[PDB]
């Protein structure tokens, strides 16, 4: 839930959404 998009496919690029 830090990124909002997805669990599944969280990896570094969804981490950098926000940071």
């Given at each position: 839930d830090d990124e909002?998009?997805?669990?599944?496919?969280?990896?570094?690029?969804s981490q950098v959404a926000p940071a």
């Open positions: 909002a998009s997805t669990t599944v496919s969280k990896t570094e690029t």
